Every structure is written in structure tokens, then in C-alpha cells.
Design a protein around this ligand. Structure first.
Ligand SMILES: C[S@@+](CC[C@H](N)C(=O)[O-])C[C@H]1O[C@@H](n2cnc3c(N)ncnc32)[C@H](O)[C@@H]1O
Ligand SMILES: Cn1c(=O)c2ncn([C@@H]3CN(C(=O)CCN)C[C@H]3O)c2n(C)c1=O
Ligand SMILES: [Cl-]
Ligand code: NA
Ligand code: NA
Ligand SMILES: [Zn+2]
Ligand SMILES: [Zn+2]
Lengths: 300, 115
């Protein structure tokens, strides 16, 4: 029955194992889903991701702030940003970013390495599709990766509002142990595989409702091995079925409450509310962003 | 007095038989929407496709300034409904056609204010 879902989430029992990392071997490797006429893979992928996020307890405040890293494509456009903007309530502030230039429907776009990106304010939802194809090297050992994953872990800890949520793209080889460890700082987490891309080891690591502190201690090396074990032993049938039913697609504007609050003020009743998707904790000032520019004169 | 004319250049390129701009971002939607031309969310009806606006704007896609004196874009950040019969060239379509300021449909592809 999973073929009518948008995708498949890691079952809890696989999260509780203590497996060793193996090579990922997917039964349907190389197969592809049949997409609706004229629909791009990345539109379908992000649609299913949002369809799955609709089933979680996302905080959706008035004046929501969403940032999207890795948003450009080799086409020079931003398919994923367009799906996010369709999903999110009208008026949602949406910022996107990528290493290379691209045209986008986001409210503001920053071009450059993600490490050059700085923002004054906190965010309610962080999406990343950052990915480097050169990390995929089947002839070398598969160790935790740094690069943009180091930036993402810092960005989450420093700039994600309590109660906010993340979805970060990983693969067999594109992954980071501290990011998994940080999943334990959310009230709930999973690894979600879109049905259109089920033939790939790609998944979105989703953290639902950020708590600012560990709820549970996760060894990220072990958990990635658990993830690959699950994938290795649970074939997922490619399916695009969920793309044909968009009647319930929009994220419900829950009008979730926003409060400023200080570390001493986060009691268990507050943490209760954060965990249920009922509260966002951050300033509600103006949203200001920037990207660092390195200055050089090459003349001589 | 010199000013590049991209709109005219694309029209002439198309006339000469050039391939229309591709990788316009087509959205999944119900196709039971209002049918208006340019909207904050996909509104295609049964006879339209909905596209992300920026990807269908000649000026956005060519990295050139917009005609508006303030540089503002009509399409960026919105969704543009394109008749399915014309969706092989969304950029051509939005350039050549104009939106009724009263009903919001495309003049000639939904606007009945003139009847
Ligand atoms: C899987 S593709 C993204 C496709 C895009 N999300 C879409 O909607 O079609 C991965 C992207 O991540 C970007 N990327 C990789 N490393 C990065 C880094 N260190 N900083 C910023 N962007 C990076 C690449 O430029 C590339 O466009
Ligand atoms: C990221 N990724 C995968 O996920 C994947 N899954 C299966 N396979 C292939 C099938 N294989 C066999 O049949 C081995 C017989 N000795 C092993 C692989 O060549 C994959 N490959 C190549 C890959 O790069
Ligand atoms: Cl663990
Ligand atoms: Na959220
Ligand atoms: Na990989
Ligand atoms: Zn434009
Ligand atoms: Zn009219």
C-alpha cells in the first residue's frame, strides 16, 4: 500500500538498531518513475516531500520564515523553491540560496557558498537540497562528511527557532554524523524517501519541532548505518501516484503563536507546546540577510 | 538612446523558427482553479498549465533589466497560467499576451469583459 503515499519514512524499529555501515544496494537501482507529462523530477520530489510534511506537527505562524539552501539547478531555475512557495501560505517569507546563479521565485536569493550566508533572524523551517556529486565514490571508505554539513549544523543550532523544523537531503555518501545527532534535539525525527526517487539512496532527514537541547542521544555513525540497513532490506516501489491528488496540498495556516523568551523561561509546559507544534520561540523583528563577499584586485 | 530590445529579439527568433525557451517550471495542481492569468498560487483550470512565474519571464531568464522603470517583475514570485495549447512556449506566451485589468484573465484566453 505504500505506493499511494508520497513516500516512505524510516520505521522506528530500524532507528533502534545498532548496525554497521554497509554498501547500499538497491534492487531497483537505475529504474525511474513515470512522471506526469512535462513534470520535472525536482518538482515531483519536492511535492512529495511537502505532502509528507503535511502529516507532521509543523508550526505555521503568521509571517512564517523559511530558508531553502541548494535551491538552484543545472537549468538555472529553482523548481524546488516554486513548490515550497506553492505549499507555504501566501505571504510566507521565503529565502533561497545556491553556489551558482539561478532565477527564483523566492523573495530574496543569495548566490555563493552557504558559509558566506548570514542572517540576523531565526527561521521557522529550513530546507536543504545541497549535494555534491563528487562525494559519491564507491571505491573509497564512506566517512561522515563535513563541508556544507558543518554549516548546516551550526545554522540549525544558532538560527532555527524553537518549535521550528528542518528537512536536509542526504544520500548513502552525502551525510554527516552530527546532523543525525542533532535530530535528537527535535521532538521527533525521521528519514523520508520520496516515492518518485525510491531507486536512489537519497533521503530527507527531517527534524520536527526543535527543542534546543538533546531529548535523546544519537550516535550518528550508527544511525546512518541503520538508515542504509533499512534501505538495503526494504525495497520501495517507484510511484508517482500521490502527484495526481493536490486537493489537500497547501500547508494549513495554523496561526501558530510566536513568543520571545529567554533560556530561563523554557519550562516543561513550554517544551510540551513546542513538541506539539503549538509554539514558535524567536524574535519577530525584520528579516535581514546578507552574503559575505571576498574582495580581490588581480591587476599588477 | 540605445536600449537592447529583448522582447523583439525573442519574437524574431521564434518567427525564424528558433526553439522556445525551455525549463519553465510546471507545477502540479488540481486544474480546477480560477483560470486567472497571474496568481499567488497555481490556478490552472482544465485548459491550462500553471508555471512558476520567474521561469516564464523573458527578463528573469535572460538576466536583463525589466521594462518597468522600477525594474519590478509581474511574474516573479507568482504563478502564471498558460493555455495548454501554448504551454510549449510559456515565455513567448506571457510576452505576447496581456492580462485584463478588470477580470484578471488573459485578454483573448478567458477575458469576456469585451462581450
Ligand atoms: C541536487 S542539486 C539541487 C537541485 C535544486 N534543489 C532543485 O530544486 O532543482 C544540489 C545543489 O546544491 C548546491 N551546493 C552544493 N554544495 C554547496 C555549498 N557548499 N554551498 C551552497 N550550495 C551548494 C549545488 O550548486 C547544486 O545546485
Ligand atoms: C548508489 N548506488 C546504489 O544505490 C546501488 N544499488 C545497487 N547498485 C548496483 C547493483 N549492484 C549489483 O548488482 C552487484 C552484483 N555484484 C551493485 C551496484 O553496481 C548500486 N550502485 C552502483 C550505486 O552507485
Ligand atoms: Cl543511536
Ligand atoms: Na515549522
Ligand atoms: Na551516494
Ligand atoms: Zn521577470
Ligand atoms: Zn476582462
Amino acid at each position: 500500500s505504500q505506493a499511494w503515499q508520497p513516500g516512505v519514512a524510516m520505521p522506528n524499529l530500524y532507528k533502534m538498531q545498532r548496525m554497521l555501515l554497509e554498501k547500499c544496494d538497491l534492487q531497483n537501482y537505475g529504474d525511474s518513475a513515470t512522471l506526469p507529462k512535462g513534470i520535472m523530477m525536482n518538482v515531483a520530489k519536492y511535492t512529495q516531500l511537502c505532502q509528507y510534511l503535511n502529516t507532521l506537527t509543523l508550526a505555521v505562524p503568521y509571517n512564517m520564515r523559511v530558508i531553502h539552501f541548494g535551491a538552484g539547478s543545472d537549468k538555472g531555475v529553482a523548481p524546488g523553491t516554486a513548490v515550497l512557495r506553492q505549499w507555504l501560505p501566501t505571504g510566507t517569507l521565503l529565502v533561497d540560496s545556491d553556489l551558482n546563479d539561478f532565477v527564483s521565485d523566492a523573495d530574496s536569493t543569495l548566490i555563493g557558498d552557504c558559509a558566506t550566508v548570514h542572517t540576523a533572524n531565526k527561521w521557522d523551517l529550513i530546507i536543504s537540497d545541497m549535494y555534491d556529486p563528487k562525494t559519491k565514490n564507491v571505491t573509497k571508505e564512506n566517512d561522515s562528511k563535513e563541508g556544507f554539513f558543518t554549516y548546516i549544523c551550526g545554522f540549525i543550532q544558532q538560527k532555527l527557532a524553537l518549535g521550528g523544523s528542518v528537512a536536509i537531503k542526504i544520500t548513502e555518501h552525502s551525510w554527516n554524523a552530527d546532523l543525525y545527532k542533532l535530530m535528537g534535539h527535535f521532538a521527533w525525527w525521521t528519514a523520508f524517501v520520496t516515492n518518485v526517487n525510491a531507486s536512489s539512496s537519497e533521503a530527507f532527514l527531517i527534524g520536527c519541532n526543535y527543542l534546543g537541547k538533546p531529548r535523546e542521544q544519537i550516535d550518528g555513525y550508527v544511525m546512518h548505518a541503520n538508515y542504509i540497513f533499512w534501505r538495503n532490506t526494504n525495497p520501495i516501489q517507484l510511484s508517482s501516484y500521490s502527484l495526481f491528488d493536490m486537493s489537500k496540498f497547501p500547508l494549513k495556516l495554523r496561526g501558530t503563536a510566536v513568543m520571545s523568551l529567554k533560556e530561563g523561561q523554557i519550562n516543561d509546559m513550554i517544551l510540551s507546546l513546542l513538541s506539539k507544534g503549538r509554539l514558535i520561540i524567536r524574535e519577530n523583528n525584520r528579516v535581514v540577510i546578507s552574503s559575505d563577499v571576498l574582495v580581490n584586485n588581480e591587476n599588477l | 538612446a540605445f536600449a537592447v530590445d529583448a522582447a523583439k529579439a525573442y519574437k524574431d527568433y521564434l518567427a525564424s523558427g528558433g526553439q522556445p525557451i525551455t525549463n519553465c517550471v510546471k507545477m502540479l495542481c488540481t486544474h480546477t482553479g480560477t483560470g486567472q492569468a497571474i496568481t499567488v498560487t497555481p490556478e490552472a483550470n482544465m485548459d491550462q498549465e500553471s508555471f512558476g512565474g520567474a521561469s516564464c519571464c523573458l527578463y528573469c531568464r535572460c538576466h536583463i533589466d525589466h521594462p518597468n522603470p522600477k525594474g519590478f517583475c509581474d511574474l516573479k514570485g507568482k504563478y502564471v497560467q498558460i493555455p495548454t495549447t501554448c504551454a510549449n512556449d510559456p515565455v513567448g506566451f506571457t510576452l505576447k499576451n496581456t492580462v485584463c485589468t478588470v477580470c484578471g484573465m488573459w485578454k483573448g484566453y478567458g477575458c469576456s469583459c469585451d462581450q
